[PDB]
Amino acid sequence: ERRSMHGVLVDIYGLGVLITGDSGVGKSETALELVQRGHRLIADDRVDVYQQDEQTIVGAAPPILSHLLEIRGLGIIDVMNLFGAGAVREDTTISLIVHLENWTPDQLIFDVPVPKITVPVKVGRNLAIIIEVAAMNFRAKSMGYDATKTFEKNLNHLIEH
Amino acid sequence: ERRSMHGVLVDIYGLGVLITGDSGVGKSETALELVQRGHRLIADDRVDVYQQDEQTIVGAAPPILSHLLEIRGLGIIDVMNLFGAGAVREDTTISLIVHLENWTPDQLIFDVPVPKITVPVKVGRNLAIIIEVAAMNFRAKSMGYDATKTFEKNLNHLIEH
Amino acid sequence: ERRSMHGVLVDIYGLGVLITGDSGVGKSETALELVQRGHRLIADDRVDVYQQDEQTIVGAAPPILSHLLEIRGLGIIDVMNLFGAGAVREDTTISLIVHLENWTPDQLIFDVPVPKITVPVKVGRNLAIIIEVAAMNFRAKSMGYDATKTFEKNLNHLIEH
Amino acid sequence: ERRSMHGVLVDIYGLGVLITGDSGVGKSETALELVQRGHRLIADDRVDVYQQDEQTIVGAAPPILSHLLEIRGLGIIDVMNLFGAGAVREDTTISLIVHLENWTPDQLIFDVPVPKITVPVKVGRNLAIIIEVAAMNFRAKSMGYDATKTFEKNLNHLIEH
Amino acid sequence: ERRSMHGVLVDIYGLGVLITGDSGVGKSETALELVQRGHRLIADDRVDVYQQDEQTIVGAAPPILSHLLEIRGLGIIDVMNLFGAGAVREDTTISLIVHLENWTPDQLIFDVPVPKITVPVKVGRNLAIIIEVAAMNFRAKSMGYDATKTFEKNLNHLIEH
Amino acid sequence: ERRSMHGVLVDIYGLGVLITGDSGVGKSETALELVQRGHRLIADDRVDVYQQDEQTIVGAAPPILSHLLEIRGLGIIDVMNLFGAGAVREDTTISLIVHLENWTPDQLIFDVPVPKITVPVKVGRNLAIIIEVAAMNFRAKSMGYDATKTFEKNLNHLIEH
């Protein structure tokens, strides 16, 4: 079977990232900068997921929404038109989700245990780049590169200075 | 004759765009990122318009303001100095206006019926790119490409799936 | 001797810039976009300064923090890993400081009279580019190019129009 | 009336530039990097000019060639498809022409006295950027900025050192 | 089983592209600009392919060559070091091959019928961008966008002008 | 005392690089792409060096040549005009030299033992990026990152696979 979720599904560095968060927070706008930044859009506002394996989930946009993105202030926008074929992608695996929230103090998952992170929304923060970094990073670990390793490496430096 | 208006007049993709909005909203700052992004500045803070035809209006900066842009925090700035000749332009036609506002719920015009749009200002929104998109888009339509057409095209897809 | 300060120390255009401001304002996030924008990180959150001359001060990161940057939402991040060698620098001279504040109305200095500027934090303002401009500008003056000169030059224009 | 010419007509910085030169030299390929670099394509391989004034000439592509560009190795290419609306433009004024030649030693014009320059083709030369510079420059002069002026300015420096 | 081939295997837009061509032609250098341009390197100079399905082939670098790239003039280079994690990728599917040749006049395939194209090497041609375009294009077709369709569309224009 | 040399002196990543090579090879053109790429020009065609220490040499342009660059096809060019203050720099230390040559088969130094490398000039090679890499690399080593280390690291992989 399949299901539907809110949020926009972009493709960053070939990494399926599903941006989620209470309406108005800035998911469509952020996905627009990401697309403008060379990344691929799959689904905006509403996403149709269809689990492929027991560890791999796929998402896509409902037929009507294809190649489209709404943005409070300009309304519906065809990214294919404005940016060319490299701004859209039919389907993709959701390898990570980013929940855009707001403010408080501070390795989650979701609907079929999928890597998830939550970033706060506040003045002076480019969500587009933070999501770009979030992806680069997630990808970096998969290869073994971790902040912890570098951190353990720095610690030696002192001990053995 | 001629007249003067508040707001900054940038040139995006050869498209005269006049950014307007209550002081402090971020018109000069936004025009600074647009310039840094390769677009041309014509007039900042105050613009002198002089209707050419009955359908074409032109705008320019008062002599003193030439090549200058003020920014709360750094004061007056000469864009010619910091970015070179490609960051400034003497005059230009105002083909579109963008009114930067704030928040509520939701094809206007103005002083000689000129295409106009209003975008809300709120955390997580790169006004510079939204204005860049606004221009690309306005330009796209003039060529026939519309979200509606793509939308009607998607609708068929289902009907004739 | 030496001392320690809060704030992040980036290197922009070979210009040592120390970003300061009440926690949460967005110094680490902003330094992350600057790094992503090709600039070099020296120290994040905490900086260790060691005056070289009576006019030249140097700053560096405590051994553990080396190559690292924390960001509310992704935690500790190794910029060397994500961006390569050109995103980090061991030490550097602090030629300018930028204090990120908020709101009110409106050529300072500090601990060994060092050029300083204060920029307000508010929606619709890319601190990363403003700091980039701040640096370009500071650098421009050192070469004689000033807004004042251009301003005096524009004034003639009228007088001798 | 109208006429037709060989060469590709790109739009750089809103400046109509008609690239010409013996087949195989690299006009289509170069116009492809320029388009990829954010500039607008008007006509490739063959251009249809139609003088507007006695000082202003306009050029456009024959209907079939619209939005297309051939490239030895990939054949016909639709730039609208690959790059979006901002990669094409219907018509434009030819303000400058650049003749791509080869080698020898060293302010021309043409068919209705139009500013013209000739650049040599040889290993280690990015024609795309040289044409970009050629345009920026042509534009810079129109505003008064000239190498000669800067040169006369440098000369004083010594005399009055 | 598996096999080995000459040429470099880059990842462009998530598209496995295997650049081939007589030594000295410029495969490593070109892959270096592509990496510098944000694309991922998998294997340089020598590639180890291992067919996954009967329609899908995979390629990777021999253990020693990992993260490395030789360039006549600088010798061996670690792209991970210079550009960060986003410049390398362990393995990938070879969806297309580009054979860099030279000169003569003018839909091939190879070892398990894989889409292939041949581009000529000659002054005034940025192989990096042509390969970038080659990929965008190959990808564009898979989605239905073709030069032929646009061409048939232009033809109507006249017939029904 | 002081002396003069041929070649152009650019500043890449704050690294003084002196490009040398038989006239016509493409030093000025290459330095033009580097400047366009955000790097700083110090001296073109002719450089005036003045040894500071016994290990540190400085170079600058003769007063007349200041801010200027000649390019076969456009003649003298003022980079300050076309690109802004960030395209020029008064003086700088020459930390590396790159000799642009041509073709044959294959850790030098010079006039006060200065790190030197020689790169071949041939179709399909972006000298601008190779020089950019050359600098990043030289800089990377100074920090300990070497291809050899990564190479020794890869070798273990097999031995201890």
PDB file of C-alpha atoms in Angstrom, chain D residues 24-26 29-30 32-33 36-37 63-68 71-74 76-78 81-83 121-127, chain E residues 13 37 103 106 117-120 122-126 129-130 132-134 136-137 140 145-148 150-151 153-155 157-158:
ATOM      1  CA  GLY D  24      34.670  24.458 -35.740  1.00  0.00           C
ATOM      2  CA  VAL D  25      36.407  27.303 -33.873  1.00  0.00           C
ATOM      3  CA  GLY D  26      34.016  26.896 -30.935  1.00  0.00           C
ATOM      4  CA  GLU D  29      30.368  25.312 -27.340  1.00  0.00           C
ATOM      5  CA  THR D  30      31.401  28.680 -25.912  1.00  0.00           C
ATOM      6  CA  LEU D  32      26.857  26.789 -24.101  1.00  0.00           C
ATOM      7  CA  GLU D  33      29.201  27.601 -21.224  1.00  0.00           C
ATOM      8  CA  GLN D  36      25.374  27.489 -18.290  1.00  0.00           C
ATOM      9  CA  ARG D  37      26.953  30.557 -16.684  1.00  0.00           C
ATOM     10  CA  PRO D  63      11.724  29.731 -35.939  1.00  0.00           C
ATOM     11  CA  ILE D  64      13.046  26.122 -36.145  1.00  0.00           C
ATOM     12  CA  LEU D  65      16.291  26.879 -34.300  1.00  0.00           C
ATOM     13  CA  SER D  66      14.373  28.443 -31.381  1.00  0.00           C
ATOM     14  CA  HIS D  67      15.714  27.333 -27.965  1.00  0.00           C
ATOM     15  CA  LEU D  68      18.150  25.036 -29.741  1.00  0.00           C
ATOM     16  CA  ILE D  71      27.210  20.809 -30.275  1.00  0.00           C
ATOM     17  CA  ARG D  72      29.555  18.421 -32.064  1.00  0.00           C
ATOM     18  CA  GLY D  73      29.301  15.395 -29.785  1.00  0.00           C
ATOM     19  CA  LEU D  74      25.768  15.707 -28.386  1.00  0.00           C
ATOM     20  CA  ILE D  76      20.946  19.371 -31.069  1.00  0.00           C
ATOM     21  CA  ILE D  77      20.249  20.632 -27.513  1.00  0.00           C
ATOM     22  CA  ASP D  78      17.211  22.425 -26.036  1.00  0.00           C
ATOM     23  CA  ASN D  81      14.883  22.043 -21.126  1.00  0.00           C
ATOM     24  CA  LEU D  82      18.280  21.784 -19.484  1.00  0.00           C
ATOM     25  CA  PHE D  83      18.530  25.217 -17.891  1.00  0.00           C
ATOM     26  CA  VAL D 121      41.716  30.937 -30.058  1.00  0.00           C
ATOM     27  CA  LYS D 122      44.508  28.973 -28.375  1.00  0.00           C
ATOM     28  CA  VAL D 123      45.131  26.467 -25.558  1.00  0.00           C
ATOM     29  CA  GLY D 124      44.781  27.926 -22.044  1.00  0.00           C
ATOM     30  CA  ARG D 125      42.116  30.504 -22.868  1.00  0.00           C
ATOM     31  CA  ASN D 126      38.559  30.380 -21.566  1.00  0.00           C
ATOM     32  CA  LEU D 127      36.697  32.076 -24.402  1.00  0.00           C
TER      33      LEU D 127
ATOM     34  CA  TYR E  13      24.046  14.573 -10.707  1.00  0.00           C
ATOM     35  CA  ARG E  37      32.436  21.761  -9.504  1.00  0.00           C
ATOM     36  CA  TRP E 103      38.954  15.315 -34.842  1.00  0.00           C
ATOM     37  CA  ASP E 106      30.090  14.321 -37.717  1.00  0.00           C
ATOM     38  CA  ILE E 117      28.724   9.264 -26.488  1.00  0.00           C
ATOM     39  CA  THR E 118      31.981  10.500 -27.995  1.00  0.00           C
ATOM     40  CA  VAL E 119      33.116  14.097 -27.722  1.00  0.00           C
ATOM     41  CA  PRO E 120      36.051  15.657 -29.633  1.00  0.00           C
ATOM     42  CA  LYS E 122      39.996  20.693 -29.229  1.00  0.00           C
ATOM     43  CA  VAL E 123      40.908  24.246 -28.158  1.00  0.00           C
ATOM     44  CA  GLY E 124      37.958  26.316 -26.889  1.00  0.00           C
ATOM     45  CA  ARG E 125      35.969  23.440 -25.405  1.00  0.00           C
ATOM     46  CA  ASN E 126      35.330  22.983 -21.698  1.00  0.00           C
ATOM     47  CA  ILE E 129      30.827  21.471 -18.827  1.00  0.00           C
ATOM     48  CA  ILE E 130      30.182  19.407 -21.930  1.00  0.00           C
ATOM     49  CA  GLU E 132      27.987  18.099 -17.275  1.00  0.00           C
ATOM     50  CA  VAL E 133      25.590  18.899 -20.111  1.00  0.00           C
ATOM     51  CA  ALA E 134      25.886  15.383 -21.505  1.00  0.00           C
ATOM     52  CA  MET E 136      21.888  16.669 -17.633  1.00  0.00           C
ATOM     53  CA  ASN E 137      20.730  15.828 -21.111  1.00  0.00           C
ATOM     54  CA  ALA E 140      16.383  14.985 -19.351  1.00  0.00           C
ATOM     55  CA  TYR E 145      12.284  15.917 -22.655  1.00  0.00           C
ATOM     56  CA  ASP E 146      13.992  15.655 -26.005  1.00  0.00           C
ATOM     57  CA  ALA E 147      15.446  18.075 -28.560  1.00  0.00           C
ATOM     58  CA  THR E 148      13.402  16.269 -31.178  1.00  0.00           C
ATOM     59  CA  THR E 150      11.073  20.718 -29.102  1.00  0.00           C
ATOM     60  CA  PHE E 151      12.138  20.538 -32.746  1.00  0.00           C
ATOM     61  CA  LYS E 153       7.167  21.785 -31.723  1.00  0.00           C
ATOM     62  CA  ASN E 154       9.117  24.563 -33.492  1.00  0.00           C
ATOM     63  CA  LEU E 155       8.244  23.135 -36.903  1.00  0.00           C
ATOM     64  CA  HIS E 157       5.086  27.134 -35.334  1.00  0.00           C
ATOM     65  CA  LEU E 158       5.884  27.859 -39.008  1.00  0.00           C
TER      66      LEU E 158
END
